[PDB]
């Protein structure tokens with residue numbers, strides 16, 4: 001429909017430039033003809049989700065790499081893909097002109113964009129906030145009569161969420177996570193630093209905190225927003241650390257176990273919001289499987305926990321098989337969900353690297369890894385940031401798929417945007433991961449899924465410099481002869497006749 005307008009900022013690839021009169025966009029989605037496949041390609045050299053079609057062929061000869069679809073080897077069903085409506089994201093989006101705001105939101109949420117269907121919503125302030133507040137700052141208010149949503153919610157986040165939902169054809173799911181409680185519920189009396197809820201699970205402090213989640217859901221429901229899930233705490237491990245720089249609330253896994261079993265589980269189940277799912281952990285994967293063992297081996301906690309939320313700090317190395325793999329083996333009926341991912345957080349790297357193909361490849365490699373380890377969804381962090389990677393009240397700046405430049409009423413779509421969209425656009429909710437078997441050792445990363453309507457999608461990432469010829473075999477349908485160029489990502493789509 002409208003192609004990328006590329007701009008280089010001296011990094012390895014280009015951004016796509018959007019403004020009040022122009023943004024790259026797709027035509028309304030259509031599937032290729034039976035017997036044809038669609039291929040969307042992005043490359044370091046500058047191609048951005050460009051479409052080409054090819055024939056599905058009856059026959060294949062050769063000793064080149066073959067990836068054979070295993071349509072009957074079924075794994076997890078996918079919840080979806082999206083990102084976080086932080087205060088910083090909201091401020092950045094709303095600092096654009098109305099036309100550019102609309103083109104940014106369409107980029108993420110419409111079928112002319114990449115079809116996000118998840119939005120994560122902080123419960124009050126976090127580091128990606130310019131004001132520190134909770135919804136109940138008036139002290140000793142244990143019945144929460146003074147609980148209320150400030151303008152950060154009612155003027156900024158809620159209206160943008162309504163606008164996202166209007167632009168989406170896919171149903172959008174909301175996920176809520178708190179960073180800190182009111183300080184008068186905390187041992188240290190501050191939003192940050194080392195501190196936990198006062199007292200012990202089952203008591204007034206813990207019951208008040210549980211009731212705050214219900215007040216929050218009630219307040220958003222008055223604004224005609226309902227939540228798919230909440231997490232028990234954003235990064236509960238952080239509040240155990242001396243000097244933790246921003247909003248946190250410390251839980252050991254035992255503390256979270258007991259809080260869920262005695263307070264949060266019962267409180268949510270007793271509310272009009274009982275259909276909201278509760279996700280535990282909401283933290284980095286090296287805490288698994290230990291955290292899952294501690295919480296889910298207690299049947300009184302386990303009965304309230306729908307899933308395990310994991311964060312991906314893509315700047316840092318950690319094992320996947322020993323964390324996600326082992327957790328799935330021990331608790332196969334408790335879904336894994338990636339609730340936050342970010343890059344650019346190392347102080348010594350530029351927070352925002354406009355046009356970094358490497359950071360794009362980190363996103364897609366992470367997503368593939370997540371999907372191959374049974375994770376049902378993937379949620380980016382801030383939907384949009386400024387060129388500094390903020391605002392952020394502790395200067396904890398990071399990168400984002402969309403960077404807003406208010407002085408030019410412009411925004412830039414990063415390689416990360418397109419790497420995420422290779423998945424989000426083409427993997428509807430309810431899609432199921434299926435097997436994909438390589439005939440020989442190779443340097444490609446790939447994942448296959450089946451849509452609810454039976455159609456196939458395969459994403460292929462090449463992080464190498466070498467162009468790799470390959471063939472995809474769908475045993476029911478035939479062969480897709482293709483190529484995976486060096487530093488490329490491809491999504492393949494086709495209809496399946498039986």
Ligand SMILES: *[C@@H]1O[C@H](CO)[C@@H](O[C@@H]2O[C@H](CO)[C@@H](O)[C@H](O)[C@H]2NC(C)=O)[C@H](O)[C@H]1NC(C)=O
Nearest residue numbers: 002005006017018019020021022023408409410
């Ligand atoms: C928004 O960006 C577009 C795309 O770069 C600008 O339109 C271009 O303007 C230059 C200079 O006049 C022309 O050479 C291009 O042909 C234009 N491209 C298109 C696709 O129209 C546009 O001026 C910018 N809008 C605002 C309000 O700044």
Ligand SMILES: *[C@@H]1O[C@H](CO)[C@@H](O[C@@H]2O[C@H](CO)[C@@H](O)[C@H](O)[C@H]2NC(C)=O)[C@H](O)[C@H]1NC(C)=O
Nearest residue numbers: 143207210211214263266267268269270271272
């Ligand atoms: C379970 O839910 C009910 C709501 O149906 C709660 O009952 C309310 O409690 C408040 C005081 O806390 C009263 O002012 C309301 O009039 C009550 N409403 C109803 C309909 O009874 C009850 O407190 C909840 N119990 C929990 C969370 O343990």
Ligand SMILES: N[C@H](CNS(=O)(=O)c1cc(F)cc(F)c1)c1ccccc1
Nearest residue numbers: 365366368369372442443444445446447
């Ligand atoms: N062909 C393999 C990758 N195989 S895979 O696609 O099943 C995969 C498995 C993961 F656990 C994570 C991924 F992201 C991808 C390779 C690629 C690149 C260098 C060495 C080996």
Ligand SMILES: *[C@@H]1O[C@H](CO)[C@@H](O)[C@H](O)[C@H]1NC(C)=O
Nearest residue numbers: 055056057058059060061478
């Ligand atoms: C495919 O292979 C079979 C068996 O040799 C052959 O009869 C057929 O013509 C080949 N070509 C096509 C296009 O089906």
Ligand SMILES: [K+]
Nearest residue numbers: 135146147148
């Ligand atoms: K208040």
Ligand SMILES: [K+]
Nearest residue numbers: 344346349351
């Ligand atoms: K940085």
